Amino acid sequence: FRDVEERRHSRDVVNELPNPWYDYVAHALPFPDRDAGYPDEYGDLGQWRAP
């Protein structure tokens, strides 16, 4: 099954096109690579729980 599928897939042209969802992983790190602005280290007027 695998070999027939692979030869068929190679001989097919459309499916040779790249697929970003299956090709790679982007940013496998624990934290974002840029600052989205957050966090806000300051409370709010309706907020009493300061720290």
Partner: protein, 152 residues
Amino acid sequence: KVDSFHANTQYQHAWPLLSHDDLGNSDQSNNTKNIMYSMYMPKRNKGTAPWFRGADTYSVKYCEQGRYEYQRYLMINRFPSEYKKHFLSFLSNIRMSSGSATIPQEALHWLLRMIVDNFNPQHVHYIAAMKTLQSAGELDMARDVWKIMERQ
């Protein structure tokens, strides 16, 4: 009969092009007569109104910052017992033998996680990573470990 009874009691004819407001104020023609009515509305709404911050933008610094420019250098402090525990754990993970369920790249991955966790890998960690990768035959990865040491 139901359609005969159900008339258009809901909608109203749209606004002409240069129509005024329901308070009579207008833009580009009626100036300094226009009044601000954002202070008559209730102070708080229990759910965003269709016009809640609909058009709101952010600085261009946000979209033109490079990657990892925002990370500030903070010195994480931990007990010496924690240091020993974590160093031994990382050394064991690096020295884990490949083939069964771990691949040689995993030694380099675990060396890099030490950096990403704000740990200072020791010469023993570097030696172990180089030894394991060389034993697995990944000489380019061993040189990558050496370059990581130098870059550190």
